[PDB]
């Protein structure tokens, strides 16, 4: 009965839906990345262009997407989001398979611009898919995790942590599956498989969400119901500016500007120095494990010493491991100048990942619990927009100077920005638990 109890319940169905959504949307993302690379071939520059376009679009559009979410009905919003995202995936896949079948034929069928037109259409549709995914993630996580968790702060925390663990495991195990499939036949078949997976996943997820709605009756009472884009943008941004939790929300955003974060740094440096071929799997495993300890440490610290003090401790940890990284880069051993050094750098990045995940969970919970219900849309959309604005600045920094001394200067600047973010969070903390900021023991 207990096993049957959980299997039905109201948390497990939400977990299942989130897992399916993330799995589909990451397999498709990596498949899109590989296909475009195969088509053009120019690495680094094109990936950065794609990321820049994505971030620039999502900033502006999510600013309005939050408003559209907060002033409609929940079930309708979720259903619309799922439908849009999956239809977008199907159409983009159809076009990609078409251009693969007749590359040179489209290149000269009428003009040389057919190929570029198809390329920009692919970019546009893959973008629309990302907007839909952002919208559904916002609404599902924020609104439904807040309402289904009830009044128990402990249950809210456990649920946030479980979502983040599901996300890290899905990242580490998804690329691998995409690879095995894509490398077991002509590309046209991998695309087909991914599209079919997405469609069946959409149907099952709609059914699961309807079922969840039927078990939480408090999900139907929305307080508030019972040219214009510029106005919405301005109102959203000023509302974000005037919120009592502003300095906290900005503190997270400054953490996104960093070359010290994974993915970019690992690919770049390993390609320049240390390809190996087996160390990268170990690094992926280490990153996953440390993310998991970050989540569990967040839970324990929140239970023991409260929220704000959890943030301060997480910040201390991340800053210490990044000082280890800076000592590493300045060594006369010369990683690139300005084997021990790369190890030190990766260790710094990993422990910084621990601290970063703890801090992110803290800030997310603060947002969830201290924001008035009617704005559970505007504020979150604006925060996403700002995070991706800093990510765009990071991309500008990466593309500007690709030299080794440039990499050293980038490390220093990223550490500086992390420090400024943590200083703003410290000011927010002092403005709350004034004087007694220390003394973890109550």
């Amino acid at each position, epitope marked *: 009965g207990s096993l049957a109890d959980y299997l039905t319940s109201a948390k497990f169905l939400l977990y299942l839906g989130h897992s399916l959504s993330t799995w589909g949307d990451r397999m498709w993302h990596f498949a899109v990345s590989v296909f475009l690379v195969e088509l053009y071939g120019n690495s680094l520059l094109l990936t950065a262009v794609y990321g820049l376009v994505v971030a620039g679009s999502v900033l502006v559009l999510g600013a309005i997407i939050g408003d559209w979410v907060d002033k409609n009905a929940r079930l309708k919003v979720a259903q619309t989001s799922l439908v849009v995202q999956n239809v977008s995936v199907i159409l983009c896949g159809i076009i990609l398979m078409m251009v693969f079948l007749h590359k040179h034929e489209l290149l000269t069928m009428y003009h040389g611009w057919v190929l570029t037109s198809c390329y920009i259409l692919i970019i546009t549709i893959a973008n629309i898919a990302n907007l839909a995914s952002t919208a559904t993630a916002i609404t599902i996580q924020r609104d439904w995790i807040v309402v289904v968790a009830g009044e128990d702060r402990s249950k809210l925390a456990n649920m946030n942590a479980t979502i983040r663990r599901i996300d890290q495991l899905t990242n580490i195990l998804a690329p691998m599956a995409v690879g095995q499939i894509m490398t077991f036949g002509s590309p046209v078949i991998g695309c087909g498989f991914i599209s079919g997976w997405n469609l069946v996943s959409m149907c099952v997820e709609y059914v699961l969400l309807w079922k969840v709605y039927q078990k939480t009756p408090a999900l139907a009472v929305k307080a508030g119901l019972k040219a214009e884009p510029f106005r919405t943008f301005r109102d959203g941004w000023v509302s974000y500016y005037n919120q009592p*939790v502003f300095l906290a929300g900005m503190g997270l955003a400054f953490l996104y500007m960093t070359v010290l974060g994974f993915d970019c740094i690992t690919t770049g440096y390993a390609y320049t120095q240390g390809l190996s071929g087996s160390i990268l799997s170990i690094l992926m495993g280490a990153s996953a494990i440390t993310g998991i300890m970050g989540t569990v440490a967040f839970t324990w610290l929140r239970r023991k010493c*409260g929220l704000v003090r959890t943030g301060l401790i997480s910040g201390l940890a991340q800053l210490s491991c990044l000082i280890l990284c800076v000592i590493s880069v300045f060594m006369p051993g010369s990683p690139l100048d300005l084997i021990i050094s790369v190890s030190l750098l990766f260790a710094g990045v990993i422990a910084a990942r621990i601290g970063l995940w703890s801090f992110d969970l803290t800030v997310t919970q603060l947002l969830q619990e201290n924001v008035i219900e009617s704005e559970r849309g505007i504020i979150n959309g604006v925060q996403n927009s700002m995070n991706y604005l800093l990510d765009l600045l990071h991309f500008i920094m990466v593309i500007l100077a690709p030299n080794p001394e440039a990499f050293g200067l980038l490390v220093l600047i990223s550490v500086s920005f992390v420090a400024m973010g943590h200083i703003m969070y410290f000011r927010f903390a002092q*403005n709350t638990l004034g004087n007694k900021l220390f003394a973890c023991g109550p």
Partner: antibody, heavy 120, light 108 residues
Framework: EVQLQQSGAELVRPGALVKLSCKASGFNIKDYYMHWVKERPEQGLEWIGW????????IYDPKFQGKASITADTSSNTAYLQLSSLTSEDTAVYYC?????????????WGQGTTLTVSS | DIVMTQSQKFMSTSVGDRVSITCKAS??????VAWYQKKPGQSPKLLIYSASNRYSGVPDRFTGSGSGTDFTLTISNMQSEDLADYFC?????????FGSGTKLEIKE
């Protein structure tokens, strides 16, 4: 339905020790923040402090730090206020309040008020 | 700390008119302002939070407005049971400070 009950009609000699009870019914105390508020005769309201029943953290006002304590008990679902070194000034009406988060928009429910008189 | 001031203490009003209570802060607090009503020998109750939003169950004649530094509470067509005490509270930063409060009366 939600309500909070307080003891009342307290007469105290100056310099003594006194406790004020706040019993909550209809909800778990550990899920909210408990605030204590003072009202002087023909004077504005003043904020004393708050407590988190989950872990027992207490923040007070700087002008009230030396002579005010707040305790909570989740097993009996109650809160207590401790005042020390009372003078004739301290006679007032004290209120119990419930808040959602750190920066909650409002107090939704209040006690009935307790009258404390320092007499001789 | 942030000091909150209400300039006028007494509103001499007749029935059915519109009145405006003013609350002016000493710092740019933003939007984090709430209003309360209390009667003699009673406990204060919510009227408006975040300076614009009303609380479920409150009558519609109560409206809130203002932003940044100045805030106002507008009463339309008040009747014989709105004769009470009103004050404004902020929650932008700690410690929390309450307004001095304003009381209403009647004309004769």
């Amino acid at each position: 339905e939600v309500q909070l009950q307080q003891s009342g009609a307290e007469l105290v000699r100056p310099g003594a020790l006194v406790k004020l009870s706040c019993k909550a019914s209809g909800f778990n105390i550990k899920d909210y923040y408990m605030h204590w508020v003072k009202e002087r005769p023909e004077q504005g309201l003043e904020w004393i402090g708050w407590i988190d029943p989950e872990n027992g953290n207490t923040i007070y006002d700087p002008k009230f730090q030396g002579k005010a304590s707040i305790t909570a008990d989740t097993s009996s679902n109650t809160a207590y206020l401790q005042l020390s070194s009372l003078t004739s000034e301290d006679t007032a009406v004290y209120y119990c309040a419930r808040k959602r988060g750190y920066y909650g928009p409002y107090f939704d429910y209040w006690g009935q008020g307790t009258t404390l008189t320092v007499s001789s | 700390d942030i000091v909150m001031t209400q300039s006028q203490k007494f509103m001499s009003t007749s029935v059915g008119d519109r009145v405006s209570i003013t609350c002016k802060a000493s710092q740019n607090v933003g939007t984090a302002v709430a209003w309360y009503q209390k009667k003699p020998g009673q406990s204060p109750k919510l009227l408006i939070y975040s300076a614009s939003n009303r609380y479920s169950g409150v009558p519609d004649r109560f409206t809130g407005s203002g932003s940044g530094t100045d805030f106002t509470l507008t009463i339309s067509n008040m009747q014989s049971e709105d004769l009470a005490d009103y004050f404004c509270q902020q929650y932008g930063s700690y410690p929390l400070t309450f307004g001095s409060g304003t009381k209403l009366e009647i004309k004769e």
